[PDB]
Amino acid sequence: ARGPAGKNRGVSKISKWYKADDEATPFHRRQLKKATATKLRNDIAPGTVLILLAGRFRGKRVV
RNA sequence: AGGUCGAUGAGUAAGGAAAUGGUACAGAACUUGCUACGCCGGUCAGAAGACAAAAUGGGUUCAGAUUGAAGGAGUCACCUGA
Numbered sequence A: 001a002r003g004p005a006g007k008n009r010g011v012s013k014i015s016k017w018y019k020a021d022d023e024a025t026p027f028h029r030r031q032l033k034k035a036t037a038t039k040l041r042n043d044i045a046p047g048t049v050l051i052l053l054a055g056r057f058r059g060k061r062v063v
Numbered sequence B: 001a002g003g004u005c006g007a008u009g010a011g012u013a014a015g016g017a018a019a020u021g022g023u024a025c026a027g028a029a030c031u032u033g034c035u036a037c038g039c040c041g042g043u044c045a046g047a048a049g050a051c052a053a054a055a056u057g058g059g060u061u062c063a064g065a066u067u068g069a070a071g072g073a074g075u076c077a078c079c080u081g082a
């Protein structure tokens, strides 16, 4: 191995001067990915009893 | 016999530019250069098979709930009632 990092290092790699473009690249859209949030239904209250439906624990009333 | 056009091609230099020369580019062989290659490895980033769950939003549509305004023989009427 060599340890010198010269400004001569890294610019001549295949990676800069060649791009393989032939694949389809899905474009970015500002108007889709913009919105996110959380809500809780009005019946959810801190410390309510919830009914576990699908859980390995389902059928159980929980806090 | 004569005259004329044509074909071959010395020349000539008008047009043009294939051959030669010159100039400019610059892609090569060369020379300087602590690098470019690939294989494997892990991380960062991009992308991500099949069946799915949740969330958000759009086109098409379905359902359940509300509110306001105008108009009515300025609807009709009702109450109090000689």
Ligand SMILES: [Mg+2]
Pocket: none
């Ligand atoms: Mg790798």
